[PDB]
Each structure stands twice: as C-alpha cells, then as structure tokens.
Amino acid sequence: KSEVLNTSRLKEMVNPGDVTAQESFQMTATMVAASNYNFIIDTTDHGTWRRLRHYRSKVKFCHNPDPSNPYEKKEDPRFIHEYIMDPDCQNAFFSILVYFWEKLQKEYNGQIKKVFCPTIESETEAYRKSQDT
C-alpha cells in the first residue's frame, strides 16, 4: 500500500558520516526507492527536502497497446522472466555503466550536483509543494 516515511533515520541514511550498528562504520551506498503508490512526508526544514529527488514515470506497459498514445506501449514480461540470467546482457549493461561513469567523470568532474536537468528539481519542487498538510 502507500506508506508513511518517518523523518527519523533519514539523516543517517543520507549523511556521508560514520554510522553505528553498536559497531561503527563509514557508509557509502547509492540509494533508490520506487513504488506504485505514494509516500507520506511531514517536514519543511531545509536540512531535509534538499537531499531528496523525485520523479514520476509517464509510460505504461500493457499487453494490449493503445494507438496514438505515446505514453503506453506493449509490455514484454520476458524482460523479467528471463534476460537477467544471460551473461551477455549483464556484460553489455556493465559496459554501459562504466562508459556512463567515465562520461560523468570527464564532463562534470565527478559532481552530481553540477549536472543539469530541467525536469528534475522542477517536479521535485512541485512534490515539495505537496506533503504539506
């Protein structure tokens, strides 16, 4: 279902500092969240809502395609049932990732905040206009 995201635990999963277990260790991991339903955010401090990014998918994958609508296409469940276990696909994907990382390093000098995207930080601020009861 939809879930509520507690403002707690956010700082220590977003911060680059050491976090304890109580064993302490430095944590470095790119974090991603996706759901079919919406989240609940109740905060307005600039400390939060600034290390957050939001996007919304527009396309829809379904068996019976609807013509004249670019936001829908026929789905290929095979992409899920198989195409993961193939070594060749994983090799190609790994090559794509390393190429993209090298491109980022040579362009923006390893800085993700320097990169430019108009839709991002525009949809995100619109989401920030929500979640304020």
Partner 1 sequence: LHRFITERVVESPSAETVYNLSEVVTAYAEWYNTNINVKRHIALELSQELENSVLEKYLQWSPNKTRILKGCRILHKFETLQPICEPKNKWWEWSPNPS
11 phi, psi to nearest 5 deg: -60, -45
Torsion of CA 53, 59, 61, 65, to 10 degrees: 180
Q: Minimum distance from CB of 59 to ligand ADP (Å)?
A: 8
Distance, in Å, from the CA atom of 79 to the CA atom of 83, rounded to the nearest integer, reads 5
- Of 53, 49, 51, 41, the residue nearest 6 (C-alpha): 41
Say which entry of partner 1, ligand ADP, none residue 1 contacts (CB below 5 to 8 A, set by partner kind): partner 1
27 binds partner 1 (CB under 8 A): no
21 binds ligand ADP (CB under 6 A): no
Whether residue 120 contacts residue 55, with contact meaning beta carbons closer than 8 Å, is answered with yes
Distance, in Å, from the CA atom of 27 to the CA atom of 97, rounded to the nearest integer, reads 22
120 labelled as ligand-binding?
Answer: no
DSSP state of 119: S
Q: Given candidates 26, 32, 37, 46, which one binds partner 1 under the rule CB under 8 A?
A: 37
Applying CB under 8 A, the site for partner 1 has a residue count of 5
Applying CB under 6 A, the site for ligand ADP has a residue count of 7
- The mark string for 49-88 relative to ligand ADP (x by CB under 6 A, - otherwise) is ------------x-------------xxx-xx--------
Q: Minimum distance from CB of 38 to ligand ADP (Å)?
A: 14
Cite the annotated binding site by residue number: 36, 50-51, 61, 75-76, 79-80
